[PDB]
């Protein structure tokens, strides 16, 4: 079928984190960081699962996800790799924490 109920809810949640409403503190996760330009030539060493919301949606669009748990897995993996790289005293972790809050309650309202 074209996106099961759980997966459709994923489409909506992802869409929200991608909406300009959150963009002000969601842009770090829209697309993968420009590590080479950022001076971060050690990015692929630390980040073993480089994932972003666009790729989460991409994979969702290819319907490679079976359930919203797989979505949750991939989206949270994005926030997870952020915490791997950036120490607690950085913008991207504070933005990750806040965006984690919204996404958390989005999935929390999502019934399974």
């Amino acid at each position: 079928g074209k996106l099961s109920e759980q997966l459709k809810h994923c489409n909506g949640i992802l869409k929200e984190l991608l909406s300009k409403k959150h963009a002000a503190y969601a842009w770090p996760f829209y697309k993968p960081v420009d590590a080479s330009a950022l001076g971060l030539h050690d990015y692929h060493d630390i980040i073993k699962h480089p994932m972003d919301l666009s790729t989460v949606k991409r994979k969702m669009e290819n319907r490679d996800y079976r359930d919203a748990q797989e979505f949750a897995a991939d989206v949270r993996l994005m926030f997870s790799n952020c915490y791997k790289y950036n120490p607690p005293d950085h913008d991207v972790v504070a933005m990750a924490r806040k965006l984690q809050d919204v996404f958390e309650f989005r999935y929390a309202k999502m019934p399974d």
Partner: peptide, 12 residues
Amino acid sequence: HNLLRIKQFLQS
């Protein structure tokens, strides 16, 4: 981690 390298997101 302890440090390594920090993302250049300082005032972006």
